[model samples]
Target: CYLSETANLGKLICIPMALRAAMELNVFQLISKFGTDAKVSASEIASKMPNAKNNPEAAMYLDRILRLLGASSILSVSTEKLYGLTNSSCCLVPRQEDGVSLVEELLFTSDKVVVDSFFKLKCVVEEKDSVPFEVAHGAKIFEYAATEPRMNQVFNDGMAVFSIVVFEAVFRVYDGFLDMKELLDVGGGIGTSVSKIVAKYPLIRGVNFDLPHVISVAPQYPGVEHVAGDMFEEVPKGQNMLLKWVLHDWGDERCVKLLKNCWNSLPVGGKVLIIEFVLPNELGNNAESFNALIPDLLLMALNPGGKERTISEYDDLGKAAGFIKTIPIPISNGLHVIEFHK
Candidate 1:
């Protein structure tokens, strides 16, 4: 059983590339047009290929890709060998109503630089103050994205889409936001997320704080103010702060620096509402948590010494940041609301 398990594990590259190929080919989008569960033949998929027609061989290629997907249970196959969306495949569908889905995130993974970083991931052991992405691209991930148009678009869209899914769960789960009046959203992008809270609370004013480039083009929101500044240096004075998915991109030292900045910005008794993943102590601890641990590889590959934290580690972070209290708020997804009180 163990040997059989490693059989697929060793050849895991096939599925990701196959999925990426299907995504670029708009196979998932086409399936969504028919409805999430609609079964379609390989020929039907190939018939809709862009800017071309009457390509019979393309259908055969589709079957090869879809067959692997079926084997992975990403797609279900009918007796006729037609492929249908499984729950796994449905994650890539852009119904926009069923959910915006993870297609953008999946597409983001298909980037050349992003993919190449994984190849260089092993070199991190030999180097300090460098990540696999830096080794592969000769630039940090964020700075590279700042100049590269394709990386920027894909990275931004992926994160934006991902945030919505997290936000949906967050709003439904956390009642902590209900008690706050002024929310300082450090690293808040374009005030889009701020608007969500402002819409819900109606009275809670949201101060969207981020870098100069980000805030310059941010659209206006009713109770939200976009402030451009450095999260490391200072955060605008506020009662409470929302640091959503920012800390995991940084090492502990950087995290502590940012947290201290957040600490000084807020008043006594104020809380720093940190939205992040609270990981278990070990990898493959259980089946449920196994899926959540997948993102840590990206941490190793991209961010400099970035890694997910356990609840106890989070407590230590709070202590390191001079926070008086650290409370882990439960949420639906594996992510936890790590609220740090000053």
Candidate 2:
């Protein structure tokens, strides 16, 4: 058992690479196209791709990787060695109905550059002014992403995917939007969050605000207006403001600045809704709670002063920003709606 556990721990490093490779190669898409519930041989999958069929060694490697995926429970392998998509692997298939390709976005957002930064994490601690991503790539994550079109697209879409997941959960449990006439989605990318909100709450007019470059190509949605600007500078005025997964990307001072801007944008009794992961005070004995550390570490690696905050930390930020109270509205998902009232 001990040996098995140790082996499992050692293989953890390879899992993300394997998952990324599968996404890049469209392995899950191929499986879905072939048959969502049917099994296919590795040779069959290789035959569908010219590069795999042309190179014998490449075809062999593909088979080896598929086996690894099967072992990892991403794919199921039969006794005859045929591969089939499992429930978890099915999520990797790009959704044409919703235009949300999370797998592709995730593959791009967490590419080799981000993965390599983790190896140099020690530099972040050794040098007080050094960030792991800058040590790995010599540029801030946003600056580097802006220079690379593909990276920028993936990062934007990845955040959209996150917004879709969290907002869907929020809509189910929270009725806070029932009375609001207008909402400003601060730092909203490509208007995904606002689009969904306006679609659901038809009476509400939505303003989608983000960087100018991001707003340049944002798709137009009914009842949603696109505004280009920096959240640190100002936020559009509204009866309700949605800040989904935004605050955790900055330090406390910066967060307070953005929160204060949101505060200033709203009138009395107006609300600012922040959707983000509220780090638990203690790990306790629940293994699932430990997953929060992964994003916490990623924030440290990429952002100069970003890290997940606890509930009290969030309360302090809200209070500092001149909000009257911090009310937590729990959703089915692990995220929380931290409502700050002006």
Candidate 3:
């Protein structure tokens, strides 16, 4: 039993390595180009990829890798070893308009940083004040990303895609946005979230507030104005404020300070909408509850004092900032809308 369990653990480590290689080589995109219904051999896929071309050995090696992916249910394989796209693999294809690929972004940004930091976890634990990412890269995640153009793009694109996914889940389950007239998106990068909201609710005006460098490159969207500023210093007064996935990156002190700013910006009846994962006291039997562990660990590794919080924890933060009420609205897939009112 021990030997079997150890062997299984070994295969788990290799899974991400294989998937990362597949993403870098554009294997899924190649299969997608063949059409959803058609199947392609590994040699055929390798022929289209620049790295695999004119190398018979590489093609054979990719065949083995593809077979592993097929067995893992990421791709479907035929009796003759031709692979076809699965529902999961289709997500790897870049969107036609913006050319953003979530899988590519995850592989480059999250996977790269997390894996590197993971090796230095023990050192971080011992030091108590040092972050593993800082130890590995010589800077914090945000600082490092700012200096590296490619990393910065990856981080932005990844967060944008992730926010879109979370917002879709939010709108499907909650009905609070319909009444919002003027919405201020604090720390909203490139105005992705607010733009989507205003597009859906045409009458609502949005102010996308972030740092100067971020707002400088924001694309113009109708009914949405791009503003550059820091939330800790001040937030623009609005009927509603959306702080999606922002507070999680900060510690309790910073979170309280930011929420206080939000409180001051709003009127007596105004509300501040916070979209984030409210960590449960214990992992439940559901898949989403299980998946929440990933981001919790990610927060720990990437951001200083960052983590998923419980509902009570969120309420405490809200109360500390002078908010009178904490209303928890359940959203799909473990995400929650914690609404605070002054």
Candidate 4:
């Protein structure tokens, strides 16, 4: 314990592993079922998890885990020491109606395949051609996800869940979608995001486009059309194009290539809206920037040439893709709307 840094490396497992355990047993979800702000005791929580139904010791261990997380304020601790949902823990609560939550993202990222991929960091020097994920799983994430139905569901569900939150944050302050008639949502899995957009701007026709397999299972939404195709080859034509969580999965060469294709699908004066995290230029401390940077490393482990970029990089990408100019509109929740003008 004495041979440690100030931040405390040993704490790495205590928080994250504890969180995964709570998530696995639906601890936060069960607590929220009582009420958003209601508190639940460890015994109450333990009653829900498997095999812990009759075990008093399980309650004790579970209470210890709750106290550890509460000390970090991830879960709020009352004077009574019962756990309640903090803003952080609230994200973990699974939505009953839609089954979407940040917990899914946490679970998917901590999946053994993904976590195991981190062990192959040597690939940065050894196997420059393939990603750590490809090295560990014998295929890239997309190819692998396609064949493994369980992993595939987890990946898409997590991405899909986060998109709703990110897009909601974007929609709160951004208003560019008001003028367009046809809104093309490139890589819009399940049409969740686009449908929400159309619900607001009912006049704007929304085309939710994605891979054939994805669209096949996507549900129909009012004012939204589902189109299946590869974005690398071509994107559906529309008055306004939106690509959320798509560009980060590619290298600059492929991004520009796809950007050019996205540009081609729109008429003159039409703009493409890109939603993504813009990595900060500063090394200074900001939780928002720190949070964005970690995923870049995760991308390095997974995608062949994927990583988050800064605003300057985004500007160059838009200019190279033949967009006349790129305007960065900062949005809530660390997402930026890069309006690429034709």
TM-scores for all candidates?
A: 0.90, 0.87, 0.89, 0.88
lDDT of 4 by residue, 125-202 (tens): 676576788888887688887789998888877776777777778878897877778998998888888999999899
Q: Can you write out model 1's per-residue Cα lDDT over 58-125, one digit (the tens) per residue?
A: 88878888898888888888874888877677778776575577888878766687889988877877
Model 1 regions lying over 4 Å from their true place = 1-6, 35-37, 50-52, 97-99, 285-292
**Of models 1 and 2, which has the larger TM-score?**
1
Worst 10 residues of 1 by lDDT: 283-292
Candidate 2: residue pairs that collide: none
Give the Cα lDDT of each candidate: 0.82, 0.82, 0.82, 0.83
Off by over 4 Å in 4: 1-7, 33-39, 48-50, 78-81, 95-99, 211-213
TM-score head-to-head 2 vs 4, winner: 4
Best by TM-score: 1
Better of 2 and 4 by lDDT: 4
What residue pairs are clashing in model 3?
none
Candidate 1, 170: how far from true, in Å? Answer: 0.5
Each candidate's number of clashing pairs is: 0, 0, 0, 0
lDDT of 3 at 248: 85
What TM-score would candidate 2 get against the native? 0.87
Can you write out model 2's per-residue Cα lDDT over 120-220, one digit (the tens) per residue? Answer: 88988888988888888877887897788876777666766766766777898988887878999998888888888889989999999999988999999
Better of 1 and 3 by TM-score: 1
Highest-scoring model, lDDT: 4
- What does each candidate score in C-alpha RMSD? 2.6, 2.9, 2.5, 2.7
Q: Show where candidate 3 strays beyond 4 Å.
A: 95-101, 109-111, 216-219, 284-286
